[PDB]
Design a protein around this ligand. Sequence first.
Ligand SMILES: *C(=O)[C@H]([C@@H](C)O)[C@H]1CC(SCCNC=N)=C(C(=O)O)N1
Length: 262
Amino acid sequence: VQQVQKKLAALEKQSGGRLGVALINTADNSQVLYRADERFAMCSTSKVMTAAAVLKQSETHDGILQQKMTIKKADLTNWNPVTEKYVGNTMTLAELSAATLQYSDNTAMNKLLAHLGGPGNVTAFARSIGDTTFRLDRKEPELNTAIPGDERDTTSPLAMAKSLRKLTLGDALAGPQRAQLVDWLKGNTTGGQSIRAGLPAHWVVGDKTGACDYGTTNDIAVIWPEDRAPLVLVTYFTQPQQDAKWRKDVLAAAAKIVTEGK
Ligand SMILES: *C(=O)[C@H]([C@@H](C)O)[C@H]1CC(SCCNC=N)=C(C(=O)O)N1
């Protein structure tokens, strides 16, 4: 453990940024923490809490995931990998949730936010599940500024690890909703060079990445090591320069360091 600690600290010092790690081993509830209580900009990883809020509604509102929303050229933002393929057409909340989680579509994120009534409702949802750290303040793309010292749109590695666990393995969501979130996370197409890169290839993973200003490179995941109890891992990383380049490789190394031998 203290060896895992020295390695993480060395990884951070060599990277020149600020690293935040929180790993929860559901086998014995043990934890590997590094700046786990410090706040980091979540940017794209905040889409998990947001999608989960929509899923929560579906527990009481029958067929809500089949409800349609119109996509218009005016809704488009700086990143619409999927939504731009539907200009002038409709997308269901499920499709929007999938586009948001698996391709990190910014316009889909804003569609979900509009449906939920704004980011304050996502924050409220987080509080309803016991997360008092999480906070969503803005919409896309402003929530990605990741300004140092700014608390807007941030959370701690540990708090996000606990909520991801509650949402994917716990009781924060009901069975069908819990299963849909896990499926969406496993279908993510943007995490190939992050947490997944530092893990044995056959291990099963569900995750949500994030890449924003100040070279902030994030990733939150649920890991199933073969037939052993799943691990919940959060690797957050931010740098001194506003225009810094992303370090998906730092998250891969943090991942390997804390999960090796698990
Ligand atoms: C989330 O933090 C941002 C924001 C614009 O919504 C998006 C952008 C990306 S693509 C980053 C790196 N890909 C290729 N070079 C992601 C993402 O999931 O990676 N989130």
